[PDB]
Amino acid sequence: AVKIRLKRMGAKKSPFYRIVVADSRSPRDGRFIETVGTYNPVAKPAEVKIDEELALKWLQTGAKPSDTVRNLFSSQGIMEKFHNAKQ
Amino acid sequence: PNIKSAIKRTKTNNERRVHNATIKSAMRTAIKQVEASVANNEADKAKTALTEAAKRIDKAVKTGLVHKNTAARYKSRLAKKVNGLS
Amino acid sequence: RNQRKVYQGRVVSDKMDKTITVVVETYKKHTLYGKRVKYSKKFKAHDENNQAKIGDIVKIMETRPLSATKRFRLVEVVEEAV
Amino acid sequence: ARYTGPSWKLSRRLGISLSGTGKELEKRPYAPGPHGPGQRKKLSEYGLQLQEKQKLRHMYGVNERQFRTLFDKAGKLAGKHGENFMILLDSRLDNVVYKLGLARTRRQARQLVNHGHILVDGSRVDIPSYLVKPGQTIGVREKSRNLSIIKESVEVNNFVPEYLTFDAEKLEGTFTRLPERSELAPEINEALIVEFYSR
Amino acid sequence: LTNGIEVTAYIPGIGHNLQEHSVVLIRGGRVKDLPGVRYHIVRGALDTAGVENRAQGRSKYGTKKPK
RNA sequence: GGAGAGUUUGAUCCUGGCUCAGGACGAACGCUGGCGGCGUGCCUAAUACAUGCAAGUCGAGCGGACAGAUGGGAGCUUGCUCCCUGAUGUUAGCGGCGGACGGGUGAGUAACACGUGGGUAACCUGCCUGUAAGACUGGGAUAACUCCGGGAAACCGGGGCUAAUACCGGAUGGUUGUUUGAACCGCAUGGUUCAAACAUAAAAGGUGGCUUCGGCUACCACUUACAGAUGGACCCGCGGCGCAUUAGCUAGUUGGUGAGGUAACGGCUCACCAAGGCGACGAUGCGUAGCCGACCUGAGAGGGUGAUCGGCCACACUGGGACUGAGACACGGCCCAGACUCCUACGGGAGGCAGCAGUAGGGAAUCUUCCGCAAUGGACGAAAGUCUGACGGAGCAACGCCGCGUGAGUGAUGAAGGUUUUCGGAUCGUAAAGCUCUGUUGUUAGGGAAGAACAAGUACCGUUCGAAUAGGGCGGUACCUUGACGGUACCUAACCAGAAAGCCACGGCUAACUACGUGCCAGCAGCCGCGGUAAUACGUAGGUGGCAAGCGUUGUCCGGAAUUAUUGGGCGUAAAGGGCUCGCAGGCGGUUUCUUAAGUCUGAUGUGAAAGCCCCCGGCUCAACCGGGGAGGGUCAUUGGAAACUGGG
């Protein structure tokens, strides 16, 4: 299935993450479908960039975000727009 | 096999093979009957055999043993040869 | 409706039933020296009625494989051989 | 690594004062070792280019790899290659603290910086090669405002260049603008340096 | 050599301890004036001892630093 | 955006090679060696592998065992004891999903394998979203568990019993098949929509709540159709190695008819017909090689490389085969054959590190039989959670890049001592010593992150189901829980200049000279060349120079090399005109006009993944490094235009 998940970038001890749309089977740091944003958990506060338009497009196609990405989308208010669109 | 799951998969694999063979054999048997009834020109038996051939073919598809396209091809082939009788 | 590759070319063989060997010719630049060289590509085409004879300038369109080597169909015979 | 050997002989070998004051060329203004006094030999073009390179390098106390890498960086900047190169060398933190007069010599300065006695915009920076940028304020940490050695330098020091500004009361300097090379050591013929590396 | 090739190798330095069956390490480098001598034996590698009493350019002759 | 130098001679100019100054590395070797950050580390034997781990999960699909025990009887020693089936718990087995991903290697492969641009009206797609319609009625088995035989066991056969969301009939179905009508539209086969008849083909329950106990309902699961998304399959244009001391190759080969087979076109296979197909625009054969993004080099054109990271392909002890499945002809699956290895009681069994560590061997040469699932990502589950040698960390190696140390100031009396000396002196030399100063680092204390987002669980809000004021789903909102790294980073304080500099070179190219020993010996050497009793070239010593926790040597690639010259060279005498003609193919071709639009130029559109190189910003104390935004890139494709030149008429 198509997932919205975190790709780990950066270096030892300084993790940086891209939110990419990817087939579940693909390796974590390998083939992906489309980049949707970035996530820097080490910074204070965690910097989060998301492209709403793209995020919603995939959510509506049925790509499920991973647990952490789901948390990100909630705090950014992406899940609200998704629920409301379906109603 | 080394992994416990692999051992069960080997047993399961052979059991499913046996069952499928019965189902696939019956389906082929039915096709043969229809082809026999066309060589000797017997519409009624051929026409009733064709229903039985259709039965067997579609039964294999329900389970998944034969692909939809493969079944369609068989049925088309058999149905046209039966029209040749009349 | 996407279009297939078209090739205007010249028939070179017609000895096979329903099959013509078209050839397409063009000037391609040489990779290192830049001189334009004659490049010729042969194509097997399908023509059911055997219209095109050896020498005709025929237009062919790409198709699904029709045999081991045939991948095109004769569309028209633009100019018949004299 | 960092040259911890005798200082004067470098000045003597190069025929310029590396401290800028003069005192290394008073008694023996000639190369070190027993062949210095007698010999008055002339240098080839390669010798002159190399000698000029060593003039700038030893003045600022930088190793060759770091020195050469910095030269390439100046390369990309707009304007005169040699001029830009010398601006970067002056921007080194150990140099800037020395020019502001917190240390009598560059070696002393570098040890102040290396040991962590300097602040740059309130934050500790213990790296001599730090490339001070225009606007930043160089200060001494509170723990080291009252170091004997730095007090000495602040009194004796005269003439802080025009591109810098200093406040002996607060012990905090500012890098207000770029040198522009008119202010910088004229002994150096930067033209030779650019040539030296084109080899 | 381990690849079956037979080569002539020059032994640099003053004096050596090589005999037949000594296992040695060779490196590239011809000896200009020795026809057919195209390799050097590395002093101080495998059986070849360093050079005795060598004090300058020791690294080139496999001589450890004396005290 | 492009530098040259030495060397043929008595001297010179040319030609011509050789050598050197630069950059790079998965490097190795010698000497030496303080630390930190970030990367990298079997390049050879795709050689053989001891040992441990690397794929499980679900009790909310199913039965049976085993515990657990609220209470009843219980027999008596107040010491315990059963015998149900409490709840509850555990799972050997059946069943579902997973195991086709993740991970490894580069042996094979010169090929639609790969790159690029298209095409499929010749295709398939579990899980994931959306839409719509359902989930009716019956039945027979079988593992587990028991008993028999073989076997030391492992394990291997037979008789009997029992369940399912396992399996199988029948009912109703929009798919599918046959036949028949229409409507419209393509690129030949044709495509899309509607309609009719006939024939086939579905499904499953589980958990919780509420019930008048019939059942209703939410969620998960199940069946069918249609879309979407994702993934895969096939075809085609073009591109990318050497050899002609490899010239003919092919016989299902090349087409056709028919049948079979495939998810699907197709000699894909077969039978029957015809003799065709490929090739000097390099077929065939031999050799060599995974391909690419990219990386190194260069002014560029080019040349080299294809390690780390990403994409695709191929492979899994060797060879073949098929089964299960949405997906394999399957690394840790099965069958057969071969090579090899292991256990044994000699009855019979068992295995495949090119998974992570590790061992042996080969080699000049490359690591720990480590910690943790805390983070990220997978598989299973309703969830808790289980699994995960993917991954996140730590360990070893100066292997590489970056950063910082090994002290700072003053200091002549220019001390002692070493070296040299024309014996005056010079030189190591402000260098020591002395006085003062610092604590990066080290040592010792104290404090100490971030990386953590969560989830479940309840409690509220909105909304959606529902009979519900029940209970769920979806979104929002409190509260709680969790760190391998690691008491690491980082911070603070105190003590101590104390522990922390080596390597190569100094005749010219090339920055850096003297003394002594040696006497064509010992030796040196990248090139010219040194050395045969005054060696700045050998060895040592002093000093100096170039670098610096590195420094040299060797090996490999590019440059310099215009030395394969497209950019950008030559052939009278330096190497180089065929002994000469005729001539097939090929290459090239006079002038005017018209036409065409293959080459050519041009507009628009599409495409050239991420990382990387370049530009601009920002975060690590700086730098390396990390991150964001752009730029750039093709003899590319679709579709218009121009007509001077080339090509066709």
- Strand order, sheet with most strands of chain E: 1-3-2
Strand and helix order of chain D: HHHHHHEEEHEEH
Question: What is the number of strand segments of chain D?
Answer: 5
* Shape call of chain E: globular
The spatial strand order of the largest sheet of chain D comes to 2-1-3-5-4
Radius of gyration of chain D: 17 Å
Count helical runs of chain D.
Answer: 8
Structural class of chain E: mainly beta
Largest sheet of chain E: 3 strands, mixed
The percentage helix of chain D is 40-55%
What is the chain-wise order of helices and strands of chain E?
EEE
Distance N terminus to C terminus of chain D? 26 Å
- Strand composition percent of chain E: 15-25%
Number of strands of chain E: 3
Helix content, binned percent of chain E: under 10%
- Our Rg estimate of chain E from Cα atoms comes to 12 Å
Helix vs. strand class of chain D: alpha+beta
Name the shape of chain D in a single word. globular
What's the total helix number of chain E?
A: 0
Instruction: State the end-to-end distance of chain E.
Output: 36 Å
Domain S4 RNA-binding (chain D): 91-154
GO molecular function, one term (chain D): structural constituent of ribosome
Family (chain D): Belongs to the universal ribosomal protein uS4 family.
Subunit structure (chain D): Part of the 30S ribosomal subunit. Contacts protein S5. The interaction surface between S4 and S5 is involved in control of translational fidelity.
Description:
Chain D: InterPro entries: Ribosomal_uS4, Ribosomal_uS4_bac-type, Ribosomal_uS4_CS, Ribosomal_uS4_N, S4_RNA-bd, S4_RNA-bd_sf. Chain D: One of the primary rRNA binding proteins, it binds directly to 16S rRNA where it nucleates assembly of the body of the 30S subunit. Chain D: Keywords: Repressor, Ribonucleoprotein, Ribosomal protein, RNA-binding, rRNA-binding. The structure is cut from a larger assembly and holds chains A (87 residues), B (86 residues), C (82 residues), D (199 residues) and E (67 residues). Chain A has helices at residues 52-61, 67-76, 78-86; strands spanning 2-11, 14-23, 34-40, 47-50, 64-65. Chain A is built from 3 helices and 5 strands. With 87 residues, chain A is α+β, with helices and mostly antiparallel strands. In chain A, strands 4-3-2-1-5 form a 5-stranded mixed β-sheet. In chain A, strand 3 (34-40) and strand 4 form a beta hairpin. Chain B has helices spanning 4-39, 43-63, 68-83. Chain B is elongated and about 60 Å long. Chain B contains 3 helices and no strands. Chain B is mostly helical. Chain C is an all-beta fold. Chain C is built from no helices and 5 strands. Chain C has strands at residues 6-16, 19-29, 36-46, 57-62, 70-79. Chain E is mainly β. Helices cover 0% and strands 16% of the residues of chain E. Chain E is built from no helices and 3 strands. Chain E has strands at residues 8-10, 26-28, 37-41. Chain E is globular, with a radius of gyration of 12 Å. The chains hardly touch. Chain D binds one RNA strand of 649 nucleotides through residues 1-9, 13, 27-28, 31-39, 43-44, 46-47, 50-51, 54, 63-66, 69, 93, 103-105, 107-117, 120, 123-131, 144, 147-149, 152-153, 198-199.
